[PDB]
Each structure stands twice: as structure tokens, then as C-alpha cells.
């Protein structure tokens, strides 16, 4: 199947409470595999998946050094954003980074990313071409010009086409038991009267991996987007995810409703109903 590796940085200033906290997490698909936190007792890159534990001590020192250097860079980035936005030194601010690569079934690069946000808004983003940038505003344009002058996009491209895909390839093989196993959802429909003539049908999906799923209710074969309550897909804590979709239906009309489930772990989309 297709796979992704992503690193996410969060750098959070906190005037009066020390230097900005820097957290890195890395993911292959929906599996966290490494973390770094500048607030840890002895900040290091730490394994969070068993298949990464075999990487040698040189891997850990190199990765730790990278995060320590990036802690400094993103702290500097926070000071810089204050200037570019004419902001005071009193308020707390956040810069976030996401970068990484998507690969197809053959393991070749499908798409690379390197983008940042400031206080939850788009700041700058490497375009799909891995050669040019999109700046969200005139502040980010200053960063763009600096990155164009320094040929940052070329450096990103070399990483994204090289180490990013190569390391993700090694991780997929090392973690093939789990990273390359899809767990299909366990499904069921529950029935609960709201009142004399209204019932809630709730379509459940449990125990699935990866997180991506589609759950829809139809009434006489037509989609009920507006009338369906759909919760955000949520982590169970054992690597798997959960989701449900609910519809309120007239009593007596339960059999007009079908729940539809698509997931990578299912050979074909499922159709289920309330089964008294």
C-alpha cells in the first residue's frame, strides 16, 4: 500500500516561564515512532515503536543532536516572527512545522512536504514541485526571500527524494508486521428509543488501523449527510481507532436505513442494518 513519514514540530513561547518548549514527534502512517521534548529531564530522541529500537546508538545521537539544534532554530524563529508581525515580547506564540514524504506501493516518492504555521495560521509552505514556496502574507514573504537566497528548497528536495524515502523504506520493512498490516473495523448497529416515535441508530466502527475510514448512513439508498451525527475518528490507545455515525429515525422505519463502511482492511465496502 501507500505510506507516509511525517515529523511535526511544536515550538511554544512562554514569557516569564523560561525558554520556548520544543516538541518533535515522528509518525509513519498513524503510528508514532519517535519523540523529543526540550522539557524532558535529559532531552533525547526516544523510541516510541518497537521496530525503531534496533537503530544503533549513532542513530540516536545524530537524531538527538538534530533536535537540539532545531530547538535553538525554532526559538530563534519565534523571536523573528515577533519582529515580522510587530508584536510585543509579553504574549505566548506557537510555531508549528510539518515535513516529510509520501511513497507509493513501490516505495517511490509520491509527494514531499515542508510547511509551517504561526499561531495556528498558515505561514509558509514548500510547493509540490519541491522548488518554490507559497508565503501566506508579507511577513512570510521575508522568510521566502531568505530561503530562496539560501536555496533551501533544493536542500529540502534532496532530503525528501533521498533520506526521507530511504529511511521510510527501512522502517516499513523493519515494522512490516504492524506498519503493513491493516486491521478492519469491527462493526455493529445499536438501537435506542429517544421517545415514543424516534429511535437513534448508531453505526459503530471499532478496532481499525489505519485511522482513515468512511461511515455513512443512507435512507432508501440515499445519503443522509445533513441528518447524520458523525464523531471525529478517535484513538483507542492500543494502536487502533474508533468512529461512529448516528441517525435519528422514525419508529417503525429502521429497515429503510443502511450503514456503509469503507476501510482499507475490508476487501469490499460493508453494508449493515439494525438487526433486532
Amino acid at each position: 500500500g501507500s505510506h507516509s513519514m511525517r515529523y511535526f514540530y511544536t515550538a511554544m513561547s512562554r514569557p516569564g516561564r523560561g525558554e520556548p518548549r520544543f516538541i518533535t514527534v515522528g509518525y509513519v502512517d498513524d503510528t508514532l515512532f519517535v519523540r523529543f521534548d526540550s522539557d524532558a529531564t535529559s532531552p533525547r530522541k526516544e523510541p516510541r515503536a518497537p521496530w525503531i529500537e534496533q537503530e544503533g546508538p549513532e542513530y540516536w545521537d545524530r537524531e538527538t543532536q538534530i533536535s537540539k539544534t532545531n530547538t535553538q532554530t525554532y526559538r530563534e524563529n519565534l523571536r523573528t516572527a515577533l519582529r515580522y508581525y510587530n508584536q510585543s515580547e509579553a504574549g505566548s506564540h506557537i510555531i508549528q512545522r510539518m515535513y516529510g514524504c509520501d511513497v507509493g506501493p513501490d516505495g517511490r516518492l509520491l509527494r514531499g512536504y515542508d510547511q509551517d504555521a504561526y499561531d495556528g495560521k498558515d505561514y509558509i509552505a514548500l510547493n509540490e514541485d519541491l522548488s518554490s514556496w507559497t508565503a501566506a502574507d508579507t511577513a512570510a514573504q521575508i522568510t521566502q526571500r531568505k530561503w530562496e537566497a539560501a536555496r533551501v528548497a533544493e536542500q529540502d528536495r534532496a532530503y525528501l527524494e533521498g533520506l526521507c524515502v530511504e529511511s521510510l523504506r527501512r522502517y516499513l520493512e523493519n515494522g512490516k508486521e504492524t506498519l503493513q498490516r491493516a486491521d478492519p473495523p469491527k462493526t455493529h448497529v445499536t438501537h435506542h428509543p429517544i421517545s415514543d416515535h424516534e429511535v437513534t441508530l448508531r453505526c459503530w466502527a471499532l478496532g481499525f488501523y489505519p485511522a482513515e475510514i468512511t461511515l455513512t448512513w443512507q435512507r432508501d439508498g440515499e445519503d443522509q449527510t445533513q441528518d447524520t451525527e458523525l464523531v471525529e475518528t478517535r484513538p483507542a490507545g492500543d494502536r487502533t481507532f474508533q468512529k461512529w455515525a448516528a441517525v435519528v429515525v422514525p419508529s417503525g422505519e429502521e429497515q429503510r436505513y443502511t450503514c456503509h463502511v469503507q476501510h482499507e482492511g475490508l476487501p469490499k465496502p460493508l453494508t449493515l442494518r439494525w438487526e433486532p
Binding site: 515529523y7 514540530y9 518533535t24 515522528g26 542513530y59 537524531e63 538534530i66 533536535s67 539544534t69 532545531n70 532554530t73 525554532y74 530563534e76 524563529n77 523573528t80 516572527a81 515580522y84 510555531i95 512545522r97 515535513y99 509551517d116 521575508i142 522568510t143 531568505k146 530561503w147 539560501a150 533551501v152 536542500q155 529540502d156 532530503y159 533520506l163 526521507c164 529511511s167
Partner: peptide, 9 residues
């Protein structure tokens, strides 16, 4: 594996 270094704004 991460890239060699991040970049200054």
C-alpha cells in the same frame, strides 16, 4: 530519519 538541520525564518 530527520533532515540534517531546519531553517531560520
Amino acid at each position: 530519519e530527520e533532515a540534517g538541520r531546519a531553517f531560520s525564518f
